[PDB]
Symmetry: D2
Subunit: 318 residues, 4 copies
């Protein structure tokens, strides 16, 4: 039977017999993603170039913010684009806290590289007046998370307790079609992904691990290398093909570069629901308790055999 994102979420909600707020939230986010996809693919660019005589990251943030505010399902919104948490006005408050990066990778969008939207959804835990503190939950508390990848096609990957499911946007009809059900990552991959241009700054553990991938001590084939430079594209390839993605700490950047709340945690959650792993080196990404909504974290994620091998090398230098 054909299935769509909306119909899929509704069916899961009916099984759980929830109130419907989470379904309204996801439907609103789905509408925002279709509008971002349309803008990213440059619909209407002819009018900007004068056929008849707002930047993408700003527009993307406005779409997600406005669709989430008007869903009546959220109370606190944390965005990569905003210094402070946004508190939904009282008449529109619902029960969820949403952390998101509305257009990840957009710094290099001038070269038409894949870009994406990342989101993580938490339940507000206290009855206190909503505030920035409500977003300071460990990733283990996520109720749902995922990403939209605007690549050669647009796909939404949605992770929940029931697993990870992948939906392809059919732009002819504006519907997300379920195309990959209950996806699991390979136990061990053949690709490693990181910015090797910064090798002079590498932690000694990262240097040794990468050397073993290129010069295996036994007779296995060296791994292939890929680094798009857009987190959503690199993580999605890691999910589909297996392997390992690294944005690790070094001494210049002792906490890494990627943001914990709206980059690392949603991707770590997708990975764990697909049977993968996600570590800071010292602990699971999902176990870090944040103290700042924009705090950074190191991240190494992907196939479990590859992540465990990195942790072996990391321990060796600890």
């Amino acid at each position: 039977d054909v299935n769509t994102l909306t119909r899929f979420v509704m069916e899961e909600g009916r099984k759980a017999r929830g109130t419907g707020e989470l379904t309204q939230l996801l439907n609103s986010l789905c509408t925002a993603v279709k509008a971002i996809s349309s803008a990213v693919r440059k619909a209407g660019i002819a009018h900007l170039y004068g056929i008849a005589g707002k930047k993408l990251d700003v527009l993307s943030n406005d779409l997600v913010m406005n669709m989430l505010k008007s869903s009546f399902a959220t109370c606190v919104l944390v965005s990569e684009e905003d210094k402070h948490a946004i508190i939904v006005e009282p008449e529109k408050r619902g029960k969820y806290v949403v952390c998101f990066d509305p257009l990840d990778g957009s710094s290099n969008i001038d070269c038409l590289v894949s870009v994406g939207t990342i989101f993580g959804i938490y339940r507000k835990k206290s009855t206190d007046e909503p505030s920035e503190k409500d977003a300071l939950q460990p990733g283990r508390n996520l109720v749902a998370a995922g990403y939209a990848l605007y690549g050669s096609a647009t796909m939404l990957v949605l992770a929940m307790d029931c697993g990870v499911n992948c939906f392809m946007l059919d732009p002819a009809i504006g519907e997300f079609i379920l195309v990959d059900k209950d996806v699991k990552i390979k136990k061990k991959g053949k690709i490693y992904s990181l910015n090797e241009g910064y090798a002079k700054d590498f932690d000694p553990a990262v240097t040794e691990y990468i050397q073993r991938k290129k010069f295996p001590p036994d007779n296995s084939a060296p791994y292939g290398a890929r680094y798009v430079g857009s987190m959503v594209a690199d993580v999605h390839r890691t999910l589909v093909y297996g392997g390992i993605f690294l944005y690790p700490a070094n001494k210049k950047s002792p906490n890494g570069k990627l943001r914990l709340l709206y980059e690392c945690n949603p991707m770590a959650y997708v990975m764990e629901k697909a049977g993968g792993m996600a570590t800071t080196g010292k602990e699971a990404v999902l176990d870090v308790i944040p103290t700042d909504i924009h705090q950074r974290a190191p991240v190494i994620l992907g196939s479990p055999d590859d992540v465990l091998e990195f942790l072996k090398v990391y321990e060796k230098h600890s």
Copy 2:
């Protein structure tokens, strides 16, 4: 004034006072590229999954049929076809087209950027058309370019008048001129290659990449990017500057990329943009091919970066 691909090509053809065959060819290829973009973005995928109860093959069929029906071509070389295609006599025109209809599609399962690459020659011999008419050096190209199906769809077209970039507006199905007479940066800050083959690299490549990560002059190290899809990696090189490398390795002792419909079209765009493209021993555009699917090593990009690599290459004889 706004400009479109069709109107741009027509105006250039009128200036040159040609017969119109090349304009008909390019218009036909433009139509194929829009149809490929629609399929790559998965229009109609709901019907395949039962709402009412392969991509590289379709892409090849689109380009082949639109080029045959243009009446402008006589010999067609495709990555997808083992032999050159000889256009039937009643549809024959004067141009030879070499193309890769969906480059990078081996990894399309992860939604990586993919693209279409093409190079167009005037048939040079007066012999009956045959595979030999496609064996010209890239220096003989009349036009070349690529369509990138990335976050948006863009067509990059290089001719004697330079390199011009057109964005497909999917609301109206028109390629809009957005970047005119493009030139590559003299020196970039990104290097692009699959370092997974480090064990197989020749010493010149090894030393060069070492210089990018550990500069002797205490300058900042280069960043690394490698999409694994040639059109995406080359387009970033064009837009941002830098260097792209696919050297020979043990699996690929003559290189991996195809000379006729990957290396030559990209080298032509690079040189018309003021960049460089070398095999290490000679300019890519100067290689005389003997086989339509033959491979070549390639290093291309900003001139100062390619010149620095050639300096290291000279050092190792």
Copy 3:
């Protein structure tokens, strides 16, 4: 605040504290409507004409499959099917849907506006659904409406809460709420019927039309419009006011339009918008059908106009 069809229906369903079946039904229909619109605007026609080397049947297949797979329906009545379709047991829900998947398609050769019409009932039986579950008067309708594939695509949905109009934004494939709680004008200035059959008219219809062209009180004559596509003519009546007629005559004592999936949904829309819909003898919604494909005369639109017609009909006993 912006609103969409899906979010609007979900909010109304949550207010009503229903089980969710009707919302799933409407979402599935909305997907079918978007797929029908795409085909009607001829997306992909280049492939039918050979770029790489039925419509009413497809429309019926889209509606049937999306409704079957919604798990919300048990009996489906379509203009396209001689007998009611009984949903297989594991996919059964509690609702009966009567629909015309592509009304007006006989003249789609001239690109006239076409549409989809639907009416939704709760089933009457407590087990063993059958065609009898579709033989309900229109008064039993829970929801009804139509999609108009006109210059743009619009979905009009009528429920107890009133009538709401949603424009399909094809750039994002979303139905946007653009007209809330619509009410028809009390009196219009347009009448709509096929005057080519004037020879067969009931004397009452003859007199009423004469009053529109030669008003007795020196008011302005009405304008005439007749698209010949019921959804287009009824939507114009809703938006502008006025009156639409497909009346009974001696050759066709029960009219031409079908009661279950043309007259009843349009009459329900009209009544929820403050209009009227009559057969001449009784309200359309009060007719108890005995056959799923039975015909009915229909006169609908602005209340002052329908009441003026009924006054003339009364005079002719």
Copy 4:
């Protein structure tokens, strides 16, 4: 073999050995029609209604056609339904052609989503004097090309030239007009008549009798059907496809009709004649009227030749 509008126009142009100006004109107009279609179908309307937290369609359509024609370098004088005076193209952008157009015909009722359309007629400038409004005052017989785009259930472009009438369907998935009906001809006699019968009190007596003959034929044959969309492009395209007759005739209140000669009547009369139909004012061929004002009106009766001839017989009976 598949054919597109661009490939069709180029091929006809190559045969004629022209300079390419008309092809550039038609391609620019084709781009304009695609952008009008996108706007008419409401692409982007979600932004107007606040999805992220601006100009009327007839104004936008005029701006699109005007800007694309000016930038084609193929035109010198432009007449639009929307502008009181002819637009004279600035000297560095001038070409040899005169274009008359209605950028969005029928938009008065676009609130109810009725079919709308774009109508155009193309003339060669005839005099060697500085271009002016007078260059647009040519009879329709001087037309080089004319046609219309119908934004109906699908978008179709009908293009008439010396070689006949050809119909192209816009495939919105790829933004290309695909040739779907070649060298179209209208039926010799139809079964549908089309006019606003609500104004019957004001009819000319000849029109009253003709419509009387359609509903109550003297030989007891079957009556004609009636259709009137109220959008000229929709009603005329139906007349072309199904045959029959379309009337917007003169009366005493409107002795010159209501439709505009230069950018409604003449282009449609030209399409009809190239398809083997007829188009008359009652007194003369529409294409033979020599205009004196760019916005002058003309009565028009057009369609299947046998139906128009029967109208003319009734019209002659009433002198």
